[PDB]
Amino acid sequence: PEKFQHILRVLNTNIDGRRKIAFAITAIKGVGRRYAHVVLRKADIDLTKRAGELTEDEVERVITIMQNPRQYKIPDWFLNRQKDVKDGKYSQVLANGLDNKLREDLERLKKIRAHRGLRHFWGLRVRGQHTKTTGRR
Amino acid sequence: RVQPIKLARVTKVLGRTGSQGQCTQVRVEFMDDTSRSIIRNVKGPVREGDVLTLLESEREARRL
Amino acid sequence: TPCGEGSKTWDRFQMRIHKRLIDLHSPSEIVKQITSISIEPGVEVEVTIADA
Amino acid sequence: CRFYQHKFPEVEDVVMVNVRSIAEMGAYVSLLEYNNIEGMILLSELSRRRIRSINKLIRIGRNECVVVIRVDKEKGYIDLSKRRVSPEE
């Protein structure tokens, strides 16, 4: 019966009680359920609680660990982009900046005219799998 | 219009009628009266000696 | 069915191979000798030097 | 709520029912004459003729003039007919 602590920001979304902390965070892009769960474990925060619980302190501690993942022993395999294509590292991409890179890669392979690029642009299915009577109604 | 509820007990399962064969004729001893004994059709499976709760003897239930 | 139209009809054949062994203990040759003779067709019989 | 002082209709009261959805026996309609109280139409009596038609481009949001047969103030069920209608046009 503790209100009191409420209204937390992770990146560009308002995070309040609704679900357990981990799930609450995943409003933003680049943070799945598994990502937010493992960040909280690293940051020594009980993740069973609500996001209308916990103060501003805990939030900042989460933000620092997510955006410096290697330097807090979140390994390279766990990352959304490994080695990347723009950047020679290994970067966790979050929020609006994921949308940027997705656009980049699709444009990139239209220039280079690679099969992935062309198919996606034309609206054909990028994977070689059937689209015979599927990929519509 | 209205009559009192009559308990009547299955004396003899007469056989089965119905177009699909899913209506069973029954003769029920009127229980209150041994003089009356009247034929009413039961929808369910009937085992002799079980008791119906007749709400009418109006609108006689009969072969079809 | 060759050429599959119609209905799904499946055929299942079995073949039931039967095995048995018998361990005799007694001396060397006269075992395998007296046993393996007097039979020729259609039932395999193997006499094995195995077991000490 | 409703404009009327009484909370329920009576026997052979002409009402207007909003057909919300068709399901099983007929339709669990809402009497709009008296608040939004639940009632039902068909199974036995409602139809006056059969011609094997009852809609084509008659979609939804529509409404039937009906008359009250049986009303259960306590139980909240109102058995309704449209077959009864003649001066209730």
């Binding site: 359920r33 598994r34 493992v38 474990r41 022993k73 | - | - | -």
Partner: protein, 141 residues
């Protein structure tokens, strides 16, 4: 007694706590970010479970004539979600199970013996029985 006579759920919990008291479990440099098994759709709640697993493994080995990684992996294993295909059995993480076997061996709860893999140590036999007694008084369910 065998360990089976006493409450199984209470046994593993009591033994797991006894392991914590010992002060070592030779813990991995993983289990803080892990996938774990592929039967999991969410990363582990805590890093506590390693003790519980160790207790469980010790109990399982006590039953058998000796066993290694394979036995633990099937028990912890369950149904694996294959996406939009049928769910089917699999065996998950082998690094953790191997690590648990090594760690228990280090404490001398279990040791290598005949019939392959680790079988119980008399040191472990004594430990398991002491917590078995505590459990035996507590309930039977």
């Amino acid at each position: 007694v065998t360990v089976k006579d006493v409450n199984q759920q209470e046994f593993v919990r009591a033994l797991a706590a006894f392991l914590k008291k010992s002060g070592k479990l030779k813990v991995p440099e993983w289990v803080d970010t892990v996938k774990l098994a592929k039967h999991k759709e969410l990363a582990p709640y805590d890093e506590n479970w390693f003790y519980t697993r160790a207790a469980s493994t010790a109990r399982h080995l006590y039953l058998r004539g000796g066993a290694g990684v394979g036995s633990m992996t099937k028990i912890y294993g369950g149904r694996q979600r294959n996406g939009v295909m049928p769910s089917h059995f699999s065996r998950g993480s082998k690094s953790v199970a191997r690590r648990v076997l090594q760690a228990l061996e280090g404490l001398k709860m279990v040791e290598k013996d005949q019939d392959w893999g680790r079988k119980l140590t008399p040191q472990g036999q004594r430990d398991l029985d002491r917590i078995a007694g505590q459990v035996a008084a507590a309930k039977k369910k």
